[PDB]
Ligand binder design. Structure first.
Ligand SMILES: [Cl-]
Length: 290
């Protein structure tokens, strides 16, 4: 299992360099040791971003087993500090009260431990009605409950992400064989309506074309704002070079020159909309479980 960590660190360091980031051994090695017992059966992917997030590469371990509290593991190994902020208690509340069946963690290769993900199974999704009852939920979830209901997505929460570094939370909708995000969310009229009501940048032509292939969305919320922070459309494809977008040079390099084989595998691509603009994300899959 320690040969696996040496191998993985090498891949982490090399993949970082491909997107102009340098990995921190001092930050990354403790995380590998902390999660050594769940890494072999995990799904490992690397996510690059444009915009401000371009200064780090995210490494994600997902499909982690029930029984691991990934935040508790990070705390125990000194990867992240104890906090009294509600962000620190939300994962346990989510895991008890949504039908969570697996989980994940995210770290910046430079920045260190940053996020957890909590995943229901596709056939039994989470609900905003469950989330609003949790003591540690952002107030902004209930205050925006009608956004989720009007777009028909309230009862199809497919992942809960928690960012401990920025004190934000992502709610994901759609994906896999589960209940589907309504078509209207992805049509031009809906894209314009959603971004308009949330005060986010009007959709670009390339975003509108991208949305035609999207079946997953996610909403970012915080404890310190009553407004949804951003809204992201996601697309899954084994042919990212065929997406109706212009790809950043770093993204092209990640696709063409990652130090591992993406054996006909799916990539996951996102276009986030904020009040100021659009930012892109691409995830490349190093280790996958079939
Ligand atoms: Cl529909």
């Amino acid at each position: 299992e320690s040969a696996d960590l040496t191998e993985l660190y090498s891949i982490i360091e090399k993949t970082a360099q491909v997107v102009d980031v340098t990995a921190s051994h001092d930050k990354v090695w403790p995380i590998l040791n902390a999660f050594q017992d769940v890494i072999a059966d995990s799904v490992i992917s690397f996510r690059a971003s444009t915009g401000s997030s371009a200064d780090d590469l995210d490494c994600r371990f997902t499909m982690l087993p029930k029984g691991l509290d990934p935040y508790a593991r990070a705390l125990e190994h000194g990867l992240t500090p104890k906090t009294d902020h509600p962000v620190g208690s939300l994962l346990k509340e989510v895991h008890e009260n949504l039908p969570i069946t697996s989980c994940g963690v995210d770290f910046g290769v430079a920045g260190g431990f940053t996020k957890t993900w909590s995943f229901p199974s596709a056939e039994k999704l989470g609900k905003v009605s469950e989330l609003v009852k949790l003591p540690s939920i952002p107030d902004a979830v209930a205050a925006n409950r009608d956004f989720f209901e009007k777009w028909g997505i309230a009862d199809m929460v497919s992942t809960v992400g928690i960012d401990y570094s920025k004190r934000t939370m992502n709610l994901y909708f759609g994906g896999g064989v589960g209940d589907r995000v309504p078509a209207g969310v992805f049509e031009e009229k809906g894209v314009r309506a959603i971004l308009g009501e949330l005060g986010l940048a009007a959709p670009s032509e390339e975003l509108l074309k991208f949305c035609e292939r999207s079946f997953v969305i996610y909403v970012t919320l915080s404890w310190d704002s009553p407004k949804i922070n951003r809204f992201t459309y996601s697309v899954m494809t084994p042919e990212p070079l065929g997406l109706p977008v212009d790809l950043a040079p770093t993204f092209e390099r990640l696709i063409k020159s990652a130090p591992y084989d993406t054996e006909g595998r799916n990539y996951v691509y996102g276009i986030a909309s904020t009040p100021k603009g659009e930012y892109h994300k691409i995830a490349s899959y190093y280790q996958w479980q079939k």
